Amino acid sequence: SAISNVIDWFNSLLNFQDTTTSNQINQQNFQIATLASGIKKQQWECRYS
């Protein structure tokens, strides 16, 4: 039972590890995309975006 519990805890830790890494990558990419895009000049202010 002790080894089985250790197996379960290690699997849970690996799941948390991958979820946290994916969340970090997604958050950083989302912030970079938001910074890259955003407000653009309207048609009357200037011709180009």
Partner: protein
């Protein structure tokens, strides 16, 4: 023979005959079980 090689003359004997052997084995097994249990919860009094 009993002085030199006590294997053939003396038959198998229970672990409980040895002083503290069962205590040490129980302590080690309980330590392993506590190590397994703490990782999943079930707060228990630490052995050492």
């Amino acid at each position: 023979k009993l002085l030199s090689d006590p294997a053939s003359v003396i038959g198998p004997l229970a672990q409980s005959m040895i002083t503290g052997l069962t205590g040490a084995l129980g302590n080690l097994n309980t330590a392993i079980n506590q190590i397994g249990d703490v990782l999943v919860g079930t707060v228990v009094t630490p052995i050492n």
